[PDB]
Design a protein around this ligand. Structure first.
Ligand SMILES: [Cl-]
Lengths: 240, 4
């Protein structure tokens, strides 16, 4: 997260950190039930040198605040039993960039570990709405990740504006969120983490960090997978 | 187009 601030302990208890064997934190995720996380499909694509698609090579840290303190009170470490990438995920365009991660054993909810509510398929996050992004990603493009979880408030961008700022790169599964003046944005290492819409005292997951053109640049807001459209797919594949 |  560029242009954010340190989160409070326990403030985003649905935020999860996914570490790949021998590499540390790679992507975020969100807790949606005791057994399931939402993340981004593109985090689980192989390269030469590492099979990011292999569920056995990932460790999820729930209840984490500081990457240098992974054995702190309240952290729950879990292996993954499987990764369900969306059937229509396209790794050349990032359309349908969403995956469901099954924990090997359930999380226990606590003051530091709690699920985020899913939006139903009719839920709308209208252009202009202020929502939050969180993660341990880089705090500048080309920089290094944050040890302490970062948060930043950003605004939903109109879909036609989004399409035009990033021409031939935006599909209906995507949403731009940020500021047209840049400054606050997600960045590398925030991928797969949640947008949190705080809106009464209810909080809904709005989307999933996916990609962007650099980070925090003007007229280049971050791009996120929309979540309401996937409610039934989540239900069918996880029961959640 | 080349997102990978
Ligand atoms: Cl504002």
């Amino acid at each position: 997260v560029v242009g954010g601030t340190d989160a409070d302990e326990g403030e985003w208890p649905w935020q999860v950190s996914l570490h790949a064997l021998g590499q540390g934190h790679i992507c975020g995720a969100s807790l949606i039930s005791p057994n399931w996380l939402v993340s981004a499909a593109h985090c689980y694509i192989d390269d030469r040198g590492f099979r990011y698609s292999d569920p056995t090579q990932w460790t999820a840290f729930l209840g984490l605040h500081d990457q240098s303190q992974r054995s702190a009170p309240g952290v729950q470490e879990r292996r993954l039993k499987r990764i369900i990438s969306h059937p229509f995920f396209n790794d050349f365009t990032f359309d349908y960039d969403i995956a469901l991660l099954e924990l090997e054993k359930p999380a226990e909810y606590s003051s530091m570990v709690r699920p985020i509510s899913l939006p139903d398929a009719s839920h709308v996050f209208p252009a202009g709405k202020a929502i939050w992004v969180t993660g341990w990603g880089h705090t500048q493009y080309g920089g290094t990740g944050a040890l302490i979880l970062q948060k930043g408030e950003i605004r939903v961008i109109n879909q036609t504006t989004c399409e035009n700022l990033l021409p031939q790169q935006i599909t209906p599964r995507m949403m731009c969120v940020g500021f047209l003046s840049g400054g606050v944005d997600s960045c590398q290492g925030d991928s797969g983490g949640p947008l949190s819409s705080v809106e009464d005292g209810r909080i809904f997951q709005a989307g999933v960090v996916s990609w962007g053109d650099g980070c925090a640049q003007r007229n280049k807001p971050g791009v996120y997978t929309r979540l309401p459209l996937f409610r039934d797919w989540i239900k069918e594949n996880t029961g959640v | 187009y080349x997102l990978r």
